[PDB]
């Protein structure tokens, strides 16, 4: 399995949720879409937990 | 996207709408780079350019006098030939490519007071081939170039891929810098006076060197770069040093005219001319 399915649950606690597909070790996928219960654009976040390909956090502060 | 169909609608007025001016997005960018109010401002005409002044005074008149040929008409270049309409298949046919060449060549004009040959631009291409191993060598080469010129270099990247030479695609390898105006003139003057005399056995720029149309070139070894005064002043700061190609671009119609112009600026020419 290369591309897995996930459940994005609305942040405005309606219960509304949208499902999308991602690569197995993709970053946490949050997106702003229309919640029809609330009748506005709200944040969606992943309901379940899963492991991620850990990227090194690129440093803008010039280290050393 | 509902469609990909690109189709610019016609208008009902002849006023030229500059779309950039109607926005309020880039207020600093609306000013010209020549204007003092722009952050892109730079003092251009800071001091009197010496080589340019010399060209203006002595050389330009002499060059004009040399290049006068009596009742010389225009020599048209090789162009795309049209088909004779001796068949109905010629009717929307693309034109035959030029006689010898695949690309079209320019018309050679007679030299008059307007179109006298002169220096247009210098380009200093330095592609260091050891930088396929070491990226830091490209940086050092760029610095060297900057030191030599007093102008900001631009990084060269490997455009191609090849196995025989250990060369990848998209790898920073040396640098280039297009000099124009006064900095270019200075660089030429330094080349004539300081550097090219300190090369021991140098006859000259080859007479077989050049473009077909007003462009002459030559190159300096890593040994030759140690004579540049910014390099020359400190041997110690530069352990390594890289060769370079030097593309001189003139406003000359043909290459012999360009060679003559360069000779006027004290560039020696040795080989048998074409």
């Amino acid at each position: 399995s290369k591309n897995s399915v996930i459940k994005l649950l609305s942040t405005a606690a309606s219960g509304y949720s949208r499902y999308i597909s991602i690569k197995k070790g993709a970053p946490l996928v949050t997106q702003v879409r229309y919640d029809p219960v609330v009748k506005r654009h709200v944040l969606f976040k992943e309901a379940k937990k899963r492991k991620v390909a850990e990227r090194k956090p690129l440093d803008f502060l010039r280290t050393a | 996207p509902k469609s990909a169909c690109s189709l610019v609608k016609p208008v009902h007025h002849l006023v030229k709408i500059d779309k950039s001016k109607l926005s309020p997005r880039f207020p600093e960018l609306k000013y010209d780079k020549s204007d003092i109010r722009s952050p892109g401002f730079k003092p251009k005409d800071t001091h009197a350019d010496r080589l340019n002044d010399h060209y203006l005074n002595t050389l330009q008149s002499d060059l004009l006098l040399i290049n006068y040929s009596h009742n010389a008409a225009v020599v048209k270049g090789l162009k795309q030939r049209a088909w004779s309409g001796d068949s109905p298949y010629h009717l929307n046919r693309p034109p035959k490519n030029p006689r010898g060449s695949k690309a079209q060549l320019p018309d050679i004009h007679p030299i008059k007071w307007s179109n006298i040959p002169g220096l247009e631009s210098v380009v200093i291409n330095c592609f260091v081939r050891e930088a396929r191993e070491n990226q830091l060598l490209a940086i050092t080469a760029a610095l060297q170039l900057q030191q030599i010129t007093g102008c900001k270099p631009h990084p060269i990247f490997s455009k191609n891929d090849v196995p025989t030479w250990k060369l990848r695609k998209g790898h920073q390898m040396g640098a280039k810098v297009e000099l124009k105006g006064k900095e270019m003139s200075q660089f030429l003057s330094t080349l004539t006076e300081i550097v090219l005399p300190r090369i021991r056995e140098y006859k000259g720029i080859s007479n077989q060197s050049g473009n077909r149309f007003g462009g002459i070139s030559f190159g300096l070894t890593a040994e030759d770069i140690k004579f540049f005064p910014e390099i020359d002043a400190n041997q110690d700061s530069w352990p390594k040093t890289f060769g370079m190609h030097i593309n001189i671009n003139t406003s000359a119609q043909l290459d012999y005219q360009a060679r003559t112009l360069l000779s006027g600026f004290q560039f020696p020419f040795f080989g048998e001319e074409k």
Partner: protein
């Protein structure tokens, strides 16, 4: 043995509506792969470059001098109009709505915001 016995069906990609033909809004005038015909006057274009009618009218195929080397399909609002329409003349427009003579309906419409 090994045989090359495999092929897709034909995509039905002719002109679906012809010159002088009455059209309705939404109707497909052309199915095509890339713009062989460009969407002209009173005519839209889809994802599959399908020309469709935006208004009720008469399908017309034409060339426009503004776009040489490009064939167009547009919809004239009547049969009288030469559909490469004159440039500086005013655009023939359709109002396409009806007034609510019925009082209740009009009142409802006024209320609705």
């Amino acid at each position: 043995s090994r045989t090359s016995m495999k092929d897709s069906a034909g995509r039905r990609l002719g002109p679906k509506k012809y010159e002088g033909q009455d059209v309705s809004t939404g109707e497909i005038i052309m199915r095509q792969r890339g713009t062989k015909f460009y969407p002209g006057e009173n005519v839209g274009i889809g994802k599959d470059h399908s020309i469709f009618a935006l208004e009720p009218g008469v399908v017309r195929y034409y060339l426009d001098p503004f776009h040489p080397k490009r064939k167009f399909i547009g919809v004239a609002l009547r049969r009288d109009l030469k559909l490469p329409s004159p440039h500086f003349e005013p655009t023939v427009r359709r109002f396409g709505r009806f007034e609510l003579t019925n009082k209740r309906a009009a009142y409802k419409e006024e209320n609705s915001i």
